Design a protein around this ligand. Structure first.
Ligand code: NA
Ligand SMILES: [Zn+2]
Ligand SMILES: [Zn+2]
Length: 228
């Protein structure tokens, strides 16, 4: 069950070392965004930030205050605001960051906060011993979207390329590679058959059924804009 905190943020524990959060933010709509907190030896990795510095700060102070862990590491799913909206603040805090080189390039060109270390295929970051396996498997929701796998926990943060089970629509495709998306999802499904929890960019987490569900939405979209 979730524990609600300030700045419209709630957090759920999935394992002794892994938590997933939902931060609600107002858009153009009060939209919910997801991220993860991974903790090992009182050090924490933040996977995606809430949309702004303020919510990010509240979240980071809570991890320090209640989870007794210092956020030292950060990894965003892609360049959108629900992934790097609070990166400015993380950098002032001195947090170390890793991201798809594509994400770094898009962030730079757009004048957005820029992650430090860039990878192009796979990267395994050791959070003082606990592995965070990041993978770029192709474009989808965003051209630079990655996924983060926690092998010791069997938990996958698929990010925005994955939709929750109650979703019916494709959503914002302004930055998507629509035809690559189903292919990226097949790769993700083939690579992480053991996933216990699969967390999407928005909505409720579930299991590997979200991958196939998301593939149906995307393929349905492609089918519906093909026709005469
Ligand atoms: Na997010
Ligand atoms: Zn996005
Ligand atoms: Zn998103």
């Amino acid at each position: 069950k979730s524990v609600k905190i300030s700045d419209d943020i709630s957090i759920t524990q999935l394992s002794d070392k892994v938590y997933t959060y939902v931060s609600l933010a107002e858009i153009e709509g009060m939209v919910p965004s997801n991220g993860m907190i991974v903790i090992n030896n009182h050090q924490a990795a933040l996977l995606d930030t809430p949309i702004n510095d303020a919510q990010t700060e509240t979240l980071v102070n809570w991890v320090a205050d209640s989870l007794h862990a210092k956020v030292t590491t950060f990894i965003p799913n892609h360049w959108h605001g629900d992934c790097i909206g609070g990166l400015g603040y993380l950098q002032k805090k001195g947090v170390q960051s890793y991201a798809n080189q594509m994400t770094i390039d898009l962030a730079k060109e757009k004048g957005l906060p820029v992650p430090e270390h860039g990878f192009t295929d796979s990267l395994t970051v050791s959070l003082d011993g606990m592995p965070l396996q990041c993978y770029y498997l192709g474009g989808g929701h965003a051209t630079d979207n990655i996924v983060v796998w926690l092998p010791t926990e069997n938990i996958l943060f698929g990010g925005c390329m994955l939709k929750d089970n109650q979703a019916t629509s494709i959503g914002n495709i302004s930055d998507a590679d629509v035809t690559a998306w189903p292919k990226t999802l097949d790769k993700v499904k083939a690579k992480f058959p053991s996933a216990r929890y699969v967390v999407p960019g928005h909505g409720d987490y579930g299991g590997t059924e979200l991958i196939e569900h998301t593939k149906q939405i995307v393929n349905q979209y492609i089918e519906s804009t093909s026709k005469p």
